Design a protein around this nucleic acid. Structure first.
Ligand code: DCP
Ligand code: CA
Lengths: 384, 922, 376
DNA sequence: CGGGCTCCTCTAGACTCGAC
DNA sequence: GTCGAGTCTAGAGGAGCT
């Protein structure tokens, strides 16, 4: 199954009981190993580029994990209590003071973006529309569950709010289907907020059900209203020559759930993660002797590759020996794009044995051409 | 056993004296004793009491012959007999004609008559004339070689030449070298270079093959001083030009043989080409190498008899043959030393380069508004400028907008027809700025002014260096200086009005060599005391200036020596080549590396016949503030071996003293100078070095320089410069030189030897070079000729020490070998079981050599003061002092901690006697 | 102008003036980095990640949860988590979870898995960048490398890591003399040293190396030694835990002080914004098309472009240049009407302020070469 | 007249070769 | 054709040793 494959290849992490579907969705533990962390980092980096680097007027946002707290009844998030204050007492007044003054953990990134709205408003010269994007950890009760929510808060005038919502919906669907091995597994749906506001949700057809990996809401100016009860002039943005309080559009996703989706979609037992998402792209090993000189050659090649941003797995440093087919199967499980083998013939004429995961067909390439070929392949995968 | 001379100087122990000189002898007579007593009374040295040193009793080895001179002659004849026999084979041999076409096989090829090419394993000849050609591109590895032997022509082709591969191992091994090896004589023009590329020379155990050098014998016979080679090249009294030449092979050939001029390949493919060029121009290169080998053999034919005519004592050749077999062992800590020293050098270079480049970048902003004309440091640079020379949206809408912009960009990327073929190098930057930056197409390009350094002529202007409140300025005629504005109220090296800077006076920076020399860079080590004194200061202030000078001092040795040290041809021995002692020793590292470096010493590479070497004879001693100074300490004996060695105490001082004493009377301490030399001890701080060091107030190492400079033709200018430097005066110099005098007899003896028709060394009678004899030069180069008398007597001392040490090592079967000999030191790699035997052998060798120096001069005795070494070091790494720990900037934790090298022991004669029971046998 | 004022002006800093005080900045209880500051911190984190994981042999990523198990340790001062619904006191200290104060606990929890990944072959390390919570609640982004040295070479690896960390911190610095190290010992007498940066108020320990023993690893594993004994060489050895912890929030503050005409001379591999694009007089449409194409070309290569052509506010060249200087923009590209004729664009460099012409075809290659060679 | 060497970097100069 | 960029080569000063 996929759970065993991801756990044994360090994509998943934790105890076998923590590998349950409910435990994975809750996020009450470290559910991703080093390869899972690398894959999630690649997914976050691709999201950042697609929606903050290659986008117009979208800026970085990073805020505190804690919140000031307002003792609202709906605030079910956990509270921060100082151990010294408890130890000083060691009861109604203490509990009232805790519920009144203890800060709570953030459940969504929307409020942090709304707090950061003013400075980013000044940065863009108050020119609407503009967006705020953030990737961070959000805390929700199951102990406490943590989700690596990646959300974009788009500030748009009242005009073209639904148009911008549909634009974002189609762009998010395209972005999620860009890396998808089976893009039909991603589906959008219509939904309505509890307050009657319209919105949309993005599913992924997991084997158990269509979990919402991303949700869109037309929240409007109500949220901006409370976060700023002061003067309107510090709230309203500029739309052309007019001034209007922007409508807040919430576009929030889950890169932990998205990473699980891309682990299920990208599934001998071989993962076929997109080249822009794969954690390990080149595997460098070594054949027979002379080991001392072939290891120097591999060290030079590895130093050349790492200087150009290509992630490499130094398989040549492992003293454990095994057949080449087992190594190739292991690399396929770890989603290695290309496996490079340096042999005696490499010293004589510079030819190395290059294997592609997608074809299982071998090739002979000169040493000097390996870096250029890898860079060209990665660029072609990224652009298309 | 106590003995005293007529002058109450304690002489050699009776037990030793009766064996060295024997019972009997001739007393100097009453008249000589009267002379010496009056001379000592005049200088007040007669009444001083002498502290008796403990008696020494030894069973010395039985000296051969009727006396000591016969003993040394017999030793040297036995040593160098086979190598004179092999050397005479080349003089009388006739060579078959050179083959029309050379071979292209692997290994050695033997060319018989008519060009018959036969592959062989080794030349297998007692006498060879050798030349090795190395492709510099492929690193330090032999490419091809040509050998001349009686009735054969030999050629050798490397596997890296015949076979083509993408890469070869960068670590050298014996399997990658020239197999060339009961004694055998190999002759070359720079035979050290040809020796370094032989696989049999790196074995830890010694080998009998000895190497003779045609440029060594050229320097011995008709060598030229460095002041003489300049004049000889400029031209090409002057009667010496016809009997001397530079050590180049063609220059020597046109002199000794004088045949058709020698030809060289104009392209220089071995130094300025790739392996493909050599494989495609193979025949021309092989022919031009065979031509060089033939020229070398023809030169040797005329050089061998003349050297034996001018250097008749067997000790000279027997020592020259032994001084060319140096051997330095290293281990895997050599590679770590290189890596750490390079890393620290790069770190400190980057630390200073950041500041230098920051100053450069903040400097170019003065271009705007022409503010550089006001800068007191950068107004003289080039500030020119070069012109540039010439010959929500819809998905479909957004895609079209992307495509149109991409096509619009692509349209301009095809407009390169107006672009000049040669890319202009930074037209927008100022003139001085372009030179600081490498061009964009440079394979070694690095952003910013990466070429800037402290040695450059702009740095002292960028850093706004200031000497005592004045900005530094450079004059092409007078070197560095400073501009005192106001144009005479400043005292220094004098305002040189040649520069004629408007309104300023150019005062040269004070220099250690006086107002005759010019300052090259203000970042010299001499200015650090002036930097801390507050005279030399940097414009940015703070510690930037002092830190720059400290970094410059730390990396200055490595800056000049990293090319040599990194390129030292280290050959790492495999496990099969190491001796059983290293394998079985507890300290042996099974996963470690062991090898050796053969110094490329060209023995007698000086008119004084001193050996010279690019690196090892000039390697800096380990210091706590020098990067890479632990270089010698990295020469670490293998597991189971120790570096037993010793240093001669006041070698040339005592040689001059004994010469002056012998010229005066047949005793020791006849002259005041000799008495001062004898009555002293380094351990008590009363030797002739410290005796003057305390008087003037300098260190012992500076006392050596002061005394030796004063002895060796200092004259009045040197003394007056020293007096001015120490006391800001020729009358005091006259008084010092006057104090008939203390050293008058030594000077008289030296001038009598120098002005003789054929000057010769007093001990062994080796002649001076033909370019310095009075017949060739009428009273020219007098200081070089008089200094040659003592300095070549020191080489005779070294030859005697080498002969005696080899005799003792071979007679008593000491498992040690010669390691390296700097101009007065003798380090021997000795197995642990024989370290004390080696120490006793070194002490006995010094005793015998001092006694021989006395005997050849007719003194027939030796004092107890100078009879033995102060202490013989027994160390595991080659270092100056056994107790010294390096703690260099590239090695802060020291040899004890990082490399795991403990301290050694410096043992005097009595401790060695107690440990060995006064015997060398087991 | 003060450094804090400039960084707040150019969005390197956030918060109110009361939060811009030195004590407030050092506390970490509030968001202190603006957009450019967050980008600079991400660049510094990426440089640390590359230098300590990508180019380091056998150093691996790890991600730990923000909360430690709720054990009732009296010495712990970490804030506790309480569910508000349970309220709507001894049990809180008894079982409620606590926010992590250091990343060491997560590294020790993941020590077994990283042993399995490396075939238990010592030495190896765990590296992590994340938020650590300290009582003052203050939050610090800790970049910690926990190196499991074999007991035979504890001091050697400690010295090597101290040298490596000092070199890494000095590499990006305009003044390497400000970074310094000094040996220190804790309450239990453990050997170690602390790196510092000479802030204008005094040295702050941006990085500390502690020579922990086997006790710190046995704390999280009170069981079989065989499960935690690493494979050092041939004999199984319990590793010596070194805690190399570096604060990248205080590190970014140190680099903002170190870099600081008013120009932030940030390292080319640290600066948030590297290329700025502009426009000429006219025609506007063609210049905008060229700028869009060039910007799209630059972004695909991995160069962070700042589009200044879309700015509606008019500004002189001097104001634009000063604005790009304070934001630490490496290069400013100007596209004029002459570009449509021959493809020449004017390029300005922050380091030298000198303006030079270059054909539009060679711009991307020059920028890639400059950024690649600036790292070395 | 301190000697006797070794090598390095830095810079001025003459020479060669290509480009428009 | 004339200009301008590479390319050795010579000398000078500094830094090691003895
Ligand atoms: N400035 C110098 C230094 C040395 N020498 C010569 C004279 C010495 O005999 C020989 C060896 O140098 P040392 O440094 O060993 O000088 P000493 O032998 O006098 O030192 P020590 O008595 O400590 O052995 O080199 C010289 O002529 N001028
Ligand atoms: Ca000496």
């Amino acid at each position: 199954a996929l759970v065993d494959l991801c756990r044994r290849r360090h994509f998943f992490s934790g105890t076998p009981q923590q590998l349950s579907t409910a435990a994975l969705l809750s996020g009450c533990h470290a559910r991703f190993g080093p390869l899972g962390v690398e894959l999630r980092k690649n997914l976050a980096s691709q999201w950042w580029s697609s929606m903050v680097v290659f986008r117009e007027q979208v800026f970085a946002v990073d805020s505190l994990h804690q919140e000031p707290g307002s003792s609202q009844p709906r605030d079910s998030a956990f509270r921060l209590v100082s151990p010294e204050s408890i130890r000083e007492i060691l009861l109604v007044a203490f509990l009232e003071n805790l519920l009144k003054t203890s800060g709570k953990l953030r459940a969504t990134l929307l409020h942090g973006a709304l707090e950061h709205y003013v400075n980013c408003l000044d940065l863009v010269n108050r020119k609407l529309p503009f967006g705020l994007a953030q990737i961070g950890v959000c805390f929700h009760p199951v102990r406490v569950g943590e989700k690596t929510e990646a959300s974009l808060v788009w500030f748009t005038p009242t005009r073209t709010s639904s148009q911008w919502l549909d634009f974002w919906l189609r762009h998010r669907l395209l972005w999620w289907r860009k890396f998808a091995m089976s893009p039909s597994n991603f589906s959008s749906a219509d939904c309505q907020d509890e307050l009657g506001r319209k919105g949309s949700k993005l599913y992924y057809s997991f084997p158990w059900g269509k979990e919402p990996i991303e949700t869109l809401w037309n929240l409007g100016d109500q949220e901006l209203l409370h976060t700023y009860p002061g003067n309107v002039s510090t709230i309203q943005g500029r739309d052309g020559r007019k001034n209007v309080v922007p409508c807040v559009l919430s576009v929030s996703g889950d890169v932990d759930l998205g990473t699980l989706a891309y682990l299920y979609d990208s599934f001998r037992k071989v993962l076929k993660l997109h080249p822009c998402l794969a954690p390990i792209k080149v595997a460098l090993d070594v054949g027979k002797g002379p080991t001392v000189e072939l290891r120097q050659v591999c060290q030079g090649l590895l130093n050349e590759l790492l200087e150009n941003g290509i992630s490499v797995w130094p398989g040549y440093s492992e003293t454990v020996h095994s057949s080449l087919e087992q190594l190739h199967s292991k690399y396929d499980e770890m989603s290695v794009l290309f496996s490079v083998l340096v042999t005696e013939t490499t010293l004589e004429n510079g030819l190395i044995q290059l294997r592609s995961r997608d074809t299982t067909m071998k090739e002979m390439m000169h040493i000097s051409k390996l870096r250029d070929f890898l860079v060209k392949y990665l660029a072609s995968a990224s652009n298309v | 056993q106590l003995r005293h001379n007529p002058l109450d100087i304690q002489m050699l122990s009776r037990g030793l004296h009766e064996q060295i000189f024997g019972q009997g002898g001739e007393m100097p007579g009453e008249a000589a004793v009267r002379r010496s007593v009056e001379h000592l009374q005049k200088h007040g040295l007669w009444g001083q009491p002498a502290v008796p040193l403990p008696d020494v009793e030894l069973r010395l080895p039985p000296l051969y012959g009727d006396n000591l001179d016969q003993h040394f002659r017999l030793l040297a004849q036995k040593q160098s007999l086979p190598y004179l026999e092999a050397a005479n084979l080349l003089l009388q041999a006739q060579l078959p004609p050179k083959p029309p076409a050379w071979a292209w096989a692997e290994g050695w090829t033997r060319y018989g008559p008519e060009g018959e090419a036969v592959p062989v394993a080794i030349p297998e000849e007692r006498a060879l004339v050798f030349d090795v050609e190395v492709c510099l591109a492929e690193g330090t590895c032999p490419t091809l070689a040509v050998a001349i032997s009686p009735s054969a022509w030999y050629s050798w082709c490397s596997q890296r030449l015949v076979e083509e591969r993408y890469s070869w191992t960068s670590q050298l091994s014996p399997a990658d070298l020239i197999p060339l090896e009961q004694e055998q004589l190999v002759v070359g023009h720079n035979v050290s270079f040809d020796r370094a590329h032989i696989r049999e020379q790196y074995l830890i155990q010694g080998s009998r093959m000895r190497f003779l050098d045609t440029m060594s014998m050229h320097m011995a016979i008709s060598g030229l001083s460095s002041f003489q080679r300049s004049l000889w090249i400029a031209a090409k009294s002057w009667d010496w030009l016809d009997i001397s030449s530079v050590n180049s092979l063609a220059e020597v050939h046109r002199l000794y043989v004088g045949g058709p001029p020698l030809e060289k390949e104009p392209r220089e493919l071995f130094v300025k080409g790739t392996m493909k060029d050599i494989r495609e121009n193979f025949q021309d290169l092989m022919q031009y190498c065979a031509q060089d080998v033939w020229a070398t053999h023809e030169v040797f034919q005329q050089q061998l008899p003349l050297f034996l005519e001018r250097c008749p004592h067997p000790v000279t050749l027997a020592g020259m043959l032994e001084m060319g077999v140096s051997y330095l062992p290293v281990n895997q800590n050599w590679e770590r030393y290189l890596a750490e020293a390079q890393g620290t050098y790069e770190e400190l270079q980057r630390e200073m380069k950041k500041s230098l480049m920051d100053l450069a970048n903040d400097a170019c902003q003065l271009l705007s508004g022409e503010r550089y004309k006001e800068d007191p440091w950068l107004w003289d640079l080039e500030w020119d400028l070069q012109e540039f020379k010439q010959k929500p949206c819809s998905e479909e809408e957004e895609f079209q907008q992307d495509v149109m912009a991409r096509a619009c960009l692509q349209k301009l990327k095809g407009t390169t027809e107006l672009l000049p073929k040669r890319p202009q190098h930074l037209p927008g930057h100022p003139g001085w700025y372009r030179k600081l930056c490498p061009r964009l197409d440079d394979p070694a390009w690095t952003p910013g002014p990466s070429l800037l350094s402290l040695q450059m002529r702009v740095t002292p202007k960028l850093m706004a260096l200031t000497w005592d409140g004045f900005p530094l300025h450079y004059s092409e005629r007078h070197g560095w200086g400073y501009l005192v504005p106001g144009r005479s109220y400043h005292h220094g090296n004098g305002p040189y009005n040649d520069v004629d800077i408007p309104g300023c006076w150019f005062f040269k920076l004070p220099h250690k060599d006086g107002n005759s020399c010019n300052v090259g860079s203000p970042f010299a080590k001499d200015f650090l005391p002036k930097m801390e004194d507050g005279t030399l200061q940097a414009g940015p202030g703070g510690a930037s200036g002092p830190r720059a000078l400290e970094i410059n001092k730390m990396i200055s040795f490595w800056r000049n020596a990293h090319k040599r040290i990194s390129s030292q041809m280290v050959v790492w021995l495999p496990r099969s080549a190491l001796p059983r002692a290293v394998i079985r020793h507890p300290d042996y590292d099974e996963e470690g590396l062991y090898g050796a470096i053969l110094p490329q010493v060209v023995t007698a590479g000086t008119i004084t016949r001193r050996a010279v070497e690019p690196t090892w004879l000039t390697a800096s001693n380990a210091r706590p503030d020098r990067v890479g100074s632990e270089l010698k300490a990295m020469v670490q004996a293998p597991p189971g071996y120790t570096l037993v060695g010793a240093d001669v105490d006041s070698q040339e001082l005592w040689i001059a003293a004994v010469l002056g004493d012998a010229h005066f009377a047949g005793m020791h301490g006849c002259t005041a100078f000799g008495w001062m030399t004898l009555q002293g001890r380094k351990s008590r701080g009363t030797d002739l070095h410290s005796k003057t060091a305390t008087t003037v107030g300098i260190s012992r190492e500076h006392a050596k320089i002061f005394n030796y400079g004063r002895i060796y033709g200092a004259g009045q200018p040197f003394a007056e410069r020293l007096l001015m430097q120490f006391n800001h005066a020729a009358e005091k110099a006259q008084q010092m030189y006057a104090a008939g005098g203390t050293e008058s007899e030594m000077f008289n003896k030296l001038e009598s030897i120098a002005t003789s028709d054929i000057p010769r060394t007093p001990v062994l009678g080796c002649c001076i070079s033909r370019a310095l004899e009075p017949s060739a030069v009428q009273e020219e180069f007098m200081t070089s000729r008089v200094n040659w008398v003592v300095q070549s007597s020191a080489v005779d001392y070294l030859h005697l020490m080498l002969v005696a040490m080899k005799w003792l090592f071979e007679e008593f079967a000491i498992d040690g070998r010669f390691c390296i000999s700097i101009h007065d030191e003798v380090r021997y790699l000795v197995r642990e079981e024989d370290r004390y035997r080696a120490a006793l052998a070194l002490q006995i060798t010094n005793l015998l050599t001092r006694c021989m120096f006395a005997y050849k001069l007719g003194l027939n005795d030796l004092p107890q003061s100078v009879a033995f070494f102060s202490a013989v070091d027994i160390d595991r790494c080659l270092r100056k002092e056994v107790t010294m720990d390096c703690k260099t900037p590239s090695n802060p934790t020291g040899m004890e901690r990082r490399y795991g090298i403990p301290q050694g022991e410096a043992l005097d004669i009595y401790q060695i006697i107690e440990l060995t029971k006064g015997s060398l046998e087991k």
